[PDB]
Amino acid sequence: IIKDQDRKSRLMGLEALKSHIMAAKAVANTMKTSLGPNGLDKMMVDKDGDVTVTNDGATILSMMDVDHQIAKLMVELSKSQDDEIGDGTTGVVVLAGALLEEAEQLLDRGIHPIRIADGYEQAARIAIEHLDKISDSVLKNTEPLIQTAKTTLGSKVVNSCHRQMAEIAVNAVLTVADDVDFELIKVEGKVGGRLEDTKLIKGVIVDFSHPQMPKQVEDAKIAILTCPFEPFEEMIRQIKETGANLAICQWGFDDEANHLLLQNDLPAVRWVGGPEIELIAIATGGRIVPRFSELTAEKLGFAGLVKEISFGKDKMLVIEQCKNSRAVTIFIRGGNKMIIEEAKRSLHDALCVIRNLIRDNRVVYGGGAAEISCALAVSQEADKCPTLEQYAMRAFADALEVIPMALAENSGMNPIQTMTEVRARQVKENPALGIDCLHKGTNDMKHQHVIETLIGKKQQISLATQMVRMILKIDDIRKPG
């Protein structure tokens, strides 16, 4: 009788293939427009009447009414790509679609789904083999690093000052580099000033109480104190009988006590949040003591410099040059908190790309150059290996030409006529040549300084390949309700 109730949707046979094809191809065509510096932005206005002008695919799919399962999968590809390294969240999407777009072809020919995955798998395994071959292992190389970072801060809202963001990214990664740990990088964000003001501190930037107090303590003896100095001469005296020159109160601070401590020449900051008080103890080593009686001469921390600087009329306490600054600090200033959010996010990506690099000296060339080189390889390797997997590898390669073709598309130049000059100028002058969407045509990427980490492309092919493969194995989905 009635196996599946109403409110369902059962995809059997070519019905499952078709649905996914038209469903994905579409979602792949949507993001494809936002690819490259010429990417076309999108406005995602949910049901709350809120606008969402973003260039990132994950940010567009996270606000797009996705009801189809296949589409959701494409949403997990950009999300995964955006939760790991982030950069190229667009690629994986467009890439996945292309592959599927080609797959359908092989399908309508009578080629079974499973088989399609096979060829695409072998080809991909080889696509990387080549991409990891053309790479030019980058050098503590200050030159290349600052460059790669600029290739990630481009076409964004932080492009107006991608130089300052990259500079901070390089030093931040180089400092906490030992294998680089992204945890030893504290990204403090506060309103005030602009984007250009963003800096990096070799210590802890804890977000003074009295004025005349020493606005410049060299090798301070931080006296981490919790209990408030409220109801003042004897209480402040003991803090001066320990050797401490920098009092850090976690609670209140009576004015009377502030002036007395002033006469002693010891700058103090009252009302210091729990977290801050804890972090300061991890930076200088200072020990957190309860009452002002447990405060000895070994609970004092040592910071190379403690100066209160007004970062755009936003005066704050800076604790840098600590003994063991295991925790760095990247202060991102700026007016509209919205712009900064964009900067902080990009920074994340800028720092991750460096890390993937530092822990793997291998970089490729964007502009599709690599894609072209691969598409060519896979094709020839598809011939050196017959069997039905041959047509598969070929199709795979054809799907490796979309990225470039898209570039020419979003650039305005005829995608076809472009690939004409590309594939040509590419085989002649090595794959070091790609598509310059700025000059409309072909040109050596290595010279245009359009480089991209190997992990970017590397991972990109993977993610897209793995997901698409899954869907290919999906020929039936009984969803009740």
Next chain:
Amino acid sequence: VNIFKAGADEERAETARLSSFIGAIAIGDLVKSTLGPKGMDKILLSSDASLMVTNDGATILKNIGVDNPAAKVLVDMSRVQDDEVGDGTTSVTVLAAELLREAESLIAKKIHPQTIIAGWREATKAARQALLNSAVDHGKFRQDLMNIAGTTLSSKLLTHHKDHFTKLAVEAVLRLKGSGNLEAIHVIKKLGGSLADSYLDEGFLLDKIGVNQPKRIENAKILIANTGMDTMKEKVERILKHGINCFINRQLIYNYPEQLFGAAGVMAIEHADFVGVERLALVTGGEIASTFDHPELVKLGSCKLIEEVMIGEDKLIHFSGVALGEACTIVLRGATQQILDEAERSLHDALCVLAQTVKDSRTVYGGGCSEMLMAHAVTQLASRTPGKEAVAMESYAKALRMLPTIIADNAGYDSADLVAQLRAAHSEGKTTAGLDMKEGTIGDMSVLGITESFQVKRQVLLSAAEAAEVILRVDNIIKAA
């Protein structure tokens, strides 16, 4: 097998762009009618059965329930162009629209959006440089000031008494001209008489609360107070300890404290409008205090003359002769209510343009004169820069010719003939060729004293252009059914 629930539209390809741009175009062509000193105001009606008859585009766009994302963009533009200068509000909106309509035109020509943006980017910047060669540089000539103010007050309801308000707006900007300070100019809108009864008070004006209290206190140290003097005797005492002769309470003052004020020779005034209490702290220098236990001898402002004159049978407290006479209060009197309110803002904006003259000593020529020059400039340039960029820059210029075109339409004078008459007579009469509605023919802009302020046009060209570019970068939005 379904990505969007039943009822989720999906604008794809042209349809998406066609819908997007048109939406803004409609809104742009709507307020377009209210162009030139001879437009057609709209009788808007909210949800509370309200009849709104205004010629100001901004206001019109702020009462219209915009249910379109793109359109809302115009609401912003008109909100910026209006909060900066005044008129032209309609211009920036309309122009921005026509561009998009010209965009969807090139799109139909298979011209990729990006290249379109590029063309406009060149054209706009090119046209900008041009507005410089024509922009006449002026310099305390109370003559031009009137010509500029008289052109800002026109195209409104005040056009009848624009001459009267011109002398006022200019007289205030010449007296308080130390660096263009519009924050020192208070606007007093009161009902009682025609608009020809409005004057300019050389000081702060804020339309007593005791017959026992000193009406006219020559030398009085104004003491601002927010909280009321009620729960009383200790209130009057403390205030007497600071040595004040003039008390200004924002809230209500009890009867008892009111008696001690008059008996102690301390003139007081309760229920003081916050807007009138805020400027007081900027006109006399009296620091506003919360409770009566906070103010002292430092919260006292210096005033040389605080009298109460029954102007037009109305008690007006004059605080003229403030420490920094660089602050006045133009009083406006209207018979009805809309007239008074419509005149107020009219002066506010009139003050803005003057603030632009005191800093931006650059002026242009209206009457579509400025645009026609642009249209002819960007054109020659278009032919210089080949590629799709040409048609773009070309279509940009032709889109700038619409300004005067509409200026002739709302005149009953055929535009088709005006465009030719103006464009041709512009290549012979230089940049001094502008449209003259009141004569139904092209006339000299400089000979008729018709000059706009640089800031105006500059903002528009820069605004619409770039803004539209982004609008053309979108090709898939999720709004509402």
Next chain:
Amino acid sequence: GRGKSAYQDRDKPAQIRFSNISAAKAVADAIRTSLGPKGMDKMIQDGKGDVTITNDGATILKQMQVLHPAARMLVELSKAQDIEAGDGTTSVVIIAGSLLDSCTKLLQKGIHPTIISESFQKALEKGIEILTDMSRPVESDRETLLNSAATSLNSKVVSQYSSLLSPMSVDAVMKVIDSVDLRDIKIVKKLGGTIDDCELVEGLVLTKVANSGITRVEKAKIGLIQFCLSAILNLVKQIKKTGCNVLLIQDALSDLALHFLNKMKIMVVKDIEREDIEFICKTIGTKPVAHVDQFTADMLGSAELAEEVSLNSGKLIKITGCASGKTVTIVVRGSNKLVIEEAERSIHDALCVIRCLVKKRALIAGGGAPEIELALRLTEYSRTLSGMESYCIRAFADAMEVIPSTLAENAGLNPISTVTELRNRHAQGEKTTGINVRKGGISNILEELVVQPLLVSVSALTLATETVRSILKIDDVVNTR
């Protein structure tokens, strides 16, 4: 997608124009049949049931619920005319509906709206000037003031006492000739006796509650209070501290409060209509204090004698001898409300007429004389003014023939034929040349004793035209609702 939600109106060119003219005219046609001495009344039965059989366009337009604003406009005209001259309230609308229907004859041709509005203005500036310079500017003159009151009292149920009603009207105005303030002459009816007992008192006479209250205060000190006197002793005591011996409460009055006002010898009158409290404010000078608290000694008015006269078995609160006779009271007496209703109404007119005569010591002969007068000169004005205005103005003149055409109509005569006879007997005669609907044919209106103050015509022409001119510019108005 949607840019303009449903339910919202967006009156566009061809549509809105046609709409405003069509129904407006129709609306005019409605009361059009109620024009003339033999006009046609209409029984207006609203929802509730209140049946109103009136002939006055205003009394009709205000009794009818208008849906779209365009029609409401006419209601504003007849309503504005009913306050600026009283008579003519009917014509104004008719003429307006004629200009609209006439203008359209120009629109259909191709004439642009704004030009038409501009044209009509020229005819208005010239037109109005014609009626005036051609009117008969006689001497105020005490005599004429009595002739203007007599001709406005007869033809009614007050003609029986027109001789005694005319003077009172002249005296009432001579005491308010500040240029006459109708709202200064308050009328109070009091059933009983006869109309011949009408008396004009100098002071605001309202329409006692404290038995022990001074029902006759010599040197009173009027005191207005809005807030009710309930919980009481402290409230009454405070009233006797200001010296108030005549408390006039707008709200209710408690018994306990009455007893305290009866012991302090303070005449109190509770539940005083809001309209009354306002008149006592503009006549005695006593400021209507909101709360009994804010009441002070400076809110005390000046009353020479506030007694409780028993006018024909009626207890009214006479407050004559006010400070600043701008406020005259006419006690109308009549056996039945029916005869009193006529007296009051007819008197109202006798007042309105004297008001028009003073605002313009001229007077034009009705009967369609001034209409054909203008219609003639205007037709000649066109042939000399040139421009599209010609046609327009002519139609503006022909649109005047309606008044005289409608007169002969409501008289049974042949409108077309009769008018022509007038136009001929007009040129060959004088401006006094009109149509006598009572005899069937032309005749010397002035010699017939049928004159009308210029204000009547001026107001109509001025208002009507300005409006019609404006509406023409109503070709784009979104409702956004």
